[PDB]
Amino acid sequence: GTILLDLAPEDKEYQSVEEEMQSTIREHRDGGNAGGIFNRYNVIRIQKVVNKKLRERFCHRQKEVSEENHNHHNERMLFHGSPFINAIIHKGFDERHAGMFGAGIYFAENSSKSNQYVYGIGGGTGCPTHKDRSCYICHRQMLFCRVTLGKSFLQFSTIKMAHAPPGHHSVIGRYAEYVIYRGEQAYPEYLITYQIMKPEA
Numbered sequence: 001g002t003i004l005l006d007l008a009p010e011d012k013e014y015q016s017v018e019e020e021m022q023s024t025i026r027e028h029r030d031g032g033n034a035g036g037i038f039n040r041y042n043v044i045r046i047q048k049v050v051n052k053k054l055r056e057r058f059c060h061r062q063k064e065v066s067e068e069n070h071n072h073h074n075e076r077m078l079f080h081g082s083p084f085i086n087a088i089i090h091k092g093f094d095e096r097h098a099g100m101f102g103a104g105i106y107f108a109e110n111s112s113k114s115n116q117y118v119y120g121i122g123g124g125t126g127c128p129t130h131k132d133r134s135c136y137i138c139h140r141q142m143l144f145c146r147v148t149l150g151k152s153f154l155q156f157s158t159i160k161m162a163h164a165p166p167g168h169h170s171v172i173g174r175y176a177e178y179v180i181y182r183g184e185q186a187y188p189e190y191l192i193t194y195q196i197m198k199p200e201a
C-alpha cells in the first residue's frame with residue numbers, strides 16, 4: 001500500500017519543493033486557457049509518497065538504465081499533472097494509458113505546464129464542481145517526480161513514437177517536454193495539493 005508522509009511547512013524539503021513549483025510558473029501560449037490565470041500557487045500541502053513496490057520497480061529499472069547509459073541514471077525531478085494522480089501514487093505511472101511525442105508519459109520542468117494537464121488534455125472541462133479551468137476554489141493535485149531519463153534522444157518535431165529510440169531511454173521533445181516510455185522510469189516522489197491564485201487587481 002501507498003503511504004503519504006506529511007511534510008511540515010518549516011521543512012527544508014517542503015520549502016524546496018514549493019520553491020521549485022512557484023518559480024517555474026510561466027506564461028503559456030494559450031494565454032491561460034488550459035490551466036487558468038495566475039502568478040502564484042497557494043500550496044495546501046506537500047506529501048512524500050512511499051510505496052515499496054513502486055520503489056522496487058523504480059530501482060530495478062534505473063539499474064538497467066545506468067547499465068546502458070555509462071553507469072548514469074541521469075535522474076531529474078520534474079512535474080507531472082493529470083487527472084490520474086491518485087491512481088499514479090498507488091499503482092505507479094502506466095504507459096499503457098498513453099501525444100506530441102508518442103505514447104509516452106509526460107513531464108514538465110515548468111509546474112505551470114503540468115497544471116495545464118491536471119484536469120485533462122487542454123485542461124479538459126476544468127474542475128468537476130465548476131467546469132472552470134481557471135477555478136480558484138477547487139484543490140488541484142500535481143506530482144514532482146524523480147524521472148530516470150538515462151540517455152535522452154532529442155526530438156525537434158512532433159513524432160508519434162511508441163518507445164525511445166534504440167539505445168535511448170527518454171525523449172526530450174521540442175520549450176521541452178520530457179517523455180519516457182516506461183512507467184518504471186518515474187517515481188511520484190511528491191504529491192502537491194494546491195490551488196492556483198487569482199492575481200491581484
Ligand SMILES: COc1cc(Cl)c(C#N)cc1C(=O)NCCN1CCC(C(=O)c2ccc(F)cc2)CC1
Nearest residue numbers: 079080081082084087093094097098106108114117
Ligand atoms: C501529452 O499529455 C501530457 C503532457 C504533459 Cl506536459 C503532462 C504533464 N505534466 C501530462 C500529460 C497527460 O496527462 N497526458 C494524458 C496521458 N497520460 C498517460 C499515462 C497516464 C498514467 O500514467 C496512468 C497510471 C495509472 C492509471 F490508472 C491511469 C493512468 C496519465 C495520463
Ligand code: NA
Nearest residue numbers: 082104105106
Ligand atoms: Na502523461
